[PDB]
């Protein structure tokens, strides 16, 4: 699998592939690895499927209970801290997973969390099997002066290169941009195909 998350000026973009395997044997050509975790932040998945889905369910529950008890969204540092404490309360029966949470509260963030519960800030991060490819292209082409369209084009080029050069990843890319103004929005697949045909990465 592969994930990607990029912080730019006033927005943060996350995208994944959708191919779940669950054997060697690619088994599901259309999974779901990107999850809206709250009205201003989301979460990606790059590990064991069942453990990852249970973590997504628990974090949805805890953030909704949070927002209702306090009537404000949770800070991104707080949700990363909570996730790290949850993963490090049990590490000798551990969750084999690599998580990546991004969002915006007063400033955009994207945080990486390993299986041992190490949370760390960064401006662009990625996890999964084909992750070094997208780190290569993000290191080569990334600028923090980009717009939202330039950013999502960079993301599509990245995941396209990962699908070209990795066995485990593949399938149709989906992308969701989260900003402070318009909130969480997932791009429709027709727009994604339009950007792919514009950039000339289709075969």
């Amino acid at each position: 699998t592969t994930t990607v998350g990029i912080t730019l000026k006033d927005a943060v973009i996350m995208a994944t592939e959708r191919r779940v395997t669950m054997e060697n044997f690619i088994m599901h050509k259309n999974g779901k690895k990107l999850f809206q975790i709250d009205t201003y932040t989301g979460m990606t998945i790059a590990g064991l499927v069942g453990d990852a889905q249970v973590l997504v369910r628990y974090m949805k529950a805890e953030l909704e209970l949070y927002r209702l008890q306090r009537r404000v969204n949770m800070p991104i540092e707080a949700v990363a801290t909570l996730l790290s404490n949850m993963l490090n309360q049990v590490k000798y029966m551990p969750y084999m997973v690599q998580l990546l949470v991004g969002g915006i509260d007063t400033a955009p963030h994207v945080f990486s969390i390993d299986a041992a519960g190490g949370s760390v800030e960064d401006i662009y991060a990625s996890t999964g099997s084909g992750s070094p490819f997208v780190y290569g292209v993000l290191e080569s082409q990334y600028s923090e002066k980009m717009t939202v369209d330039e950013g999502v084009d960079l993301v599509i080029r990245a995941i396209s290169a990962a699908k070209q050069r990795d066995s485990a990843s593949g399938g149709m890319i989906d992308v969701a941009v989260i900003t402070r103004k318009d909130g969480y929005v997932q791009l429709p697949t027709d727009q994604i195909e339009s950007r792919i045909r514009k950039l000339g990465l289709i075969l």
């Binding site: 369910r57 628990y58 949805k60 529950a61 805890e62 909704e64 209970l65 209702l68 008890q69």
Partner: protein, 227 residues
């Protein structure tokens, strides 16, 4: 006759403590709610009499989910504790099944929680009454809760000091399918007729849902138009 101390049966077959809890919730704030054409509302009288109270920050209509809300009446501390139990129970059902498919399950678990402290000794019952409102897969539902844990389903109900006066007005003047504007108008007329014995009402607090969207609690300005 027998014990007015702790919950046992009487010679007339009456749980005295659960009675005494019902007169405790009769001493509380009045609040009501009703279904309308494609949803349900909840309006509470506001217990503001000091100007030092942070008017809008004291909410008696509290959210349990984005798809179940609750307004309470009775002892305010038992109210807060029970509402938090309802919140975490809704979260449990979200964890287990994936969604809150029945709001009736949610009122039933809370009512079982109240039945236990109706059942056992060493503890008093919950002296609090609540009404639950929201849509589920079935549709708009409006419940009530009782210090015994009795639940009943309504199209419109009340709670509090103005229980009976409001319920008499609702018994006369309720229409089943009703647009939201005329619904909140009818609800305010109900709240008026009872609470206008201190010859004042105030701005009340009022929330609503329609099927297919989330929760909306009014602001201070919108309610005074219907006032």
């Amino acid at each position: 006759a027998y014990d007015r101390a702790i919950t046992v049966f009487s010679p007339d077959g009456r749980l005295f403590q659960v009675e005494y809890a019902r007169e405790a919730v009769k001493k509380g704030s009045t609040a009501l709610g009703m279904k309308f054409a494609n949803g349900v509302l909840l309006i509470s009288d506001k217990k503001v009499r000091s100007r030092l109270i942070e008017q809008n920050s004291i909410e008696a209509i509290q959210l349990i989910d984005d798809y179940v809300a609750a307004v309470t009446s009775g002892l305010v501390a038992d109210a807060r504790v029970l509402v938090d139990f309802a919140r975490i129970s809704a979260q449990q059902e979200k964890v287990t099944y994936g969604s809150l498919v029945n709001i009736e399950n949610l009122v039933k678990r809370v009512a079982d929680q109240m039945q236990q402290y109706t059942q056992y000794g060493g503890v008093r019952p919950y002296g609090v009454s609540l009404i639950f409102a929201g849509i589920d897969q079935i549709g708009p539902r409006l419940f009530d809760c009782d210090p015994a844990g009795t639940i009943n389903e309504y199209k419109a109900t009340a709670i509090g000091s103005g229980k009976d006066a409001v319920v008499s007005f609702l018994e006369r003047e309720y229409k089943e399918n009703l647009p939201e504007k005329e619904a909140v108008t009818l609800g305010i007329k109900a709240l008026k007729s009872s609470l206008e014995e201190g010859e004042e009402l105030k701005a009340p607090e009022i929330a609503s849902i329609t099927v297919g969207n989330k929760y909306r609690i009014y602001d201070q300005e919108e309610v005074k138009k219907f006032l």
